[PDB]
Design a protein around this ligand. Sequence first.
Ligand SMILES: Nc1ncnc2c1ncn2[C@@H]1O[C@H](CSCC[C@H](N)C(=O)O)[C@@H](O)[C@H]1O
Ligand SMILES: Nc1ncnc2c1ncn2[C@@H]1O[C@H](CSCC[C@H](N)C(=O)O)[C@@H](O)[C@H]1O
Ligand SMILES: CC(C)CC(=O)C(=O)O
Ligand SMILES: CC(C)CC(=O)C(=O)O
Ligand SMILES: [Zn+2]
Ligand SMILES: [Zn+2]
Lengths: 333, 333
Amino acid sequence: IAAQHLADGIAASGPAPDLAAAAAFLEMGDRLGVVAHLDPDRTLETAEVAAALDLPEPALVRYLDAVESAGLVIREGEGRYRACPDFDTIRHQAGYISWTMNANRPFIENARDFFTDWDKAARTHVRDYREVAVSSQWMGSHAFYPTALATIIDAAPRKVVDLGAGTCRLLIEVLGAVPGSTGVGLDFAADACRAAEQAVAQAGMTDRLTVVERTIQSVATDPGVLEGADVIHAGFVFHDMLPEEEDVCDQVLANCRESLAPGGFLAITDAVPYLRNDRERRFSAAVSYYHGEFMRRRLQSEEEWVERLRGAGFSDVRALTLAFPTGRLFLAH
Amino acid sequence: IAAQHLADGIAASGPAPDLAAAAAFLEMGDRLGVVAHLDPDRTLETAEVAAALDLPEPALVRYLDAVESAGLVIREGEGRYRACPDFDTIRHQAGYISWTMNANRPFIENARDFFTDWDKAARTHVRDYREVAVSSQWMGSHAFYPTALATIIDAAPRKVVDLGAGTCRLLIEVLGAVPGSTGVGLDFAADACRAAEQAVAQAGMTDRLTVVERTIQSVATDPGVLEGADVIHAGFVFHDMLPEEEDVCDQVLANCRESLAPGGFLAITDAVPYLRNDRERRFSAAVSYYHGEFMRRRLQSEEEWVERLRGAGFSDVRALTLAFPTGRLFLAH
Ligand SMILES: Nc1ncnc2c1ncn2[C@@H]1O[C@H](CSCC[C@H](N)C(=O)O)[C@@H](O)[C@H]1O
Ligand SMILES: Nc1ncnc2c1ncn2[C@@H]1O[C@H](CSCC[C@H](N)C(=O)O)[C@@H](O)[C@H]1O
Ligand SMILES: CC(C)CC(=O)C(=O)O
Ligand SMILES: CC(C)CC(=O)C(=O)O
Ligand SMILES: [Zn+2]
Ligand SMILES: [Zn+2]
C-alpha cells in the first residue's frame, strides 16, 4: 500500500544511488591522494599515508570510516584498510561519471557563454587536465587499455612511445609485462605530466619510463624521440589538431611511418562521432557533443581514419570495436 | 580473442556510460532552462522556447540534436521535440549524480581545507542552493515524494504548509490532486525561491501557492503562517538546526503542535545516519558524510526522531522506509 511505493521507488532508482556515492567518494579521495593507496590486494597504513599526504591522521581516519560504512573499504586492523574485492570495477565505472561531470564541468556550467561568444568562452572556462587524465585512466582500465595492451605485448617490443599519454598507465602496464623494455610518454599538460611522474615512480619504473612535456605538434618538426621505436601509440590526442592543423597532423603521421623499426606499427585509440546503435549511442553523443561544440575538435569516422592512415604510407590497417562507447582501435603497419 | 576483451569490457562498464551521459546532458540543459520544457507527453517548440530562454535558436537546435542522437529526445517535426518515453526515470536517476557530483562539488574539491580549518572553509566554499533544490527534486520524484504525497491526499486538506520546500514540487503535486486547496512553501535561499516561483507559475498555481523566503528558525518566534493548517510537511530541513539550535528546534515543533487543525498532522521526511544494510549503505554513507563532516548538521536515527516527536506533544508517531536510501517518513498526529 506504501510497500508498493517502496518497491516501485527502488526499481526507478536502480543502480544510480550506489554509483553517485562511489563517484563522489572516489573523486574526493583521489584529489586528496588517498585512492592511489587503495587496492584489494594491498593495505593502506594510515600512520604512514597520512604523513606522506600531509593530512591530519584523524581526518584521514574519518574519511576511511565513511568509506568503510559505504562498503568500499574493509578495516583490517587499527590504521590498516584495504579496498573491497570489486573495487577496481567500481572505480572503473566512477571514471565515466568523473569524466562527464568533473573533467568537463566548465562546459556544463557555462554553456550560455559558449553559445554566444565561443572565443572568449574557450579561454575563460578551461578544463583541469589532471582531472581529464585521471578520469580517462579510470575509464581505460577495463574499456580501452586491455585490447591495446594485449596487441602490444605480442611482438615483445623493446621501445614503446605513447603520444598524449596522460597518467602513463598503458606504458606502466606494457613495461610491467615485457621484461626488458623502455618507454617514453609525451603529454602537453604540466598537471598530467606531474601526476604521471608520481605514478611511474610509485610503480618503480622511474628509470625505464621517461615523461617528456611536449605537444604532439612538436613531433612534426622534431621526431627525435620516436626512432628506434617498435610501437608508437596515441590514445585520444590526434583529434586535438583537427580540423585546423591538418597539415601538421599528416606530417606527424609521415614521421611515424619512417621512425618505426621494420616490424612495428602505429596504434591509435580514438573516438568516432555520433554512433546510432543502442549500446553506444548515449555516451557516444556526450563525447561527440563535448568535442564538436565545446572543444571544436574534429572526430573522424572509422572510414575516414582508415583512409587517412592508408594515404600516409601505412598498409594493413584494420579497426577494432572497443568496450568504451564510440572508442575504436586502429592498427597500422 | 579480442571479442572476449569486448564482452568483458561491456560487462565491467555496465550502466555507467549511459548514466554519466544522461547526467551531464540534463544538468547542462537544466542550467539553460531547456529541461523544464522536456516532457514525454508535451512538445518543445524551438522558435518559442529559444526566445523565452533568450538563446540563439541555432544553438538550442544543436543541443537538442545532440540529445536526440543520445536517445533522450525525439524529433517530432522541424523545431518540435519531445522527451523519450522513459525520460522521467532517466531524469530521476540523474538526480542522484547531480546531487553528489554537482550540488556538493565544493566539498569534493576542497576537502583538504575542511580538514585543516573548518570555519574558514565553511564560509569560503559554499553550495549553490539552486543546484541543491533542483537535484533533490529529481531524486524526490520517484523516491520520496510519492509516499508523502499519497498520505497527504488522504484526509483531503484545505491548507498545506511545507518548510524548506525547495522548488515546491510536493505542494504543486498536492494542490494538483486535491481540487480546492491552498499551499505555502517556506525556504531560506533566494536561489531556490526564485526557481520555485517560476515552477509554480508554470504550473498555473501562482495564486494558490505562496512562496515565502524565510528561515525555519523564523517559525519559532513567528508561527503566523502555520495556523489553519491541515498538514505541515518538512523535507530535509529540520537537521539544519542541529546540534546547535536544539532549543529553537523544539520550539518550532511545539509551535507546529498548536497550529494544527484538530484532525491533521506533522509529516517529516528526513535522513537517518550510516545505515548498514546492503541496499542503503553506500548512498547512506555519502549523505551522512556530507552532513556530518562538511555541513556539521546532526542526522538523527529513527529511534531518536520518534522520541523527539513524542516528547514534543505528538502521539501516534510511526516511521516508514522510503525508496530514497537513508530516507524515512515520520508521521506525527
Ligand atoms: N596537443 C596535444 N599534445 C599532447 N598531448 C595533448 C594535446 N592535447 C591534449 N593532450 C593530452 O591528451 C590527453 C587526452 S585524455 C588522456 C589519454 C591517455 N592516453 C589515456 O588513454 O588514458 C590529456 O592527457 C591531454 O593533456
Ligand atoms: N534553515 C533553513 N530554513 C529554511 N530552509 C532551509 C534552511 N536550511 C536549508 N534550507 C533549504 O532546505 C532545502 C534542502 S533540500 C530541498 C528539500 C525539498 N523539500 C525537497 O524535498 O525536494 C533547500 O532548499 C535549502 O535551501
Ligand atoms: C574521450 C576521452 C577518453 C579523452 C578526451 O578526448 C578528452 O577528454 O578530451
Ligand atoms: C538529503 C538531501 C535530499 C537534502 C539535503 O539535506 C541537502 O542537500 O542538504
Ligand atoms: Zn579530446
Ligand atoms: Zn541537509
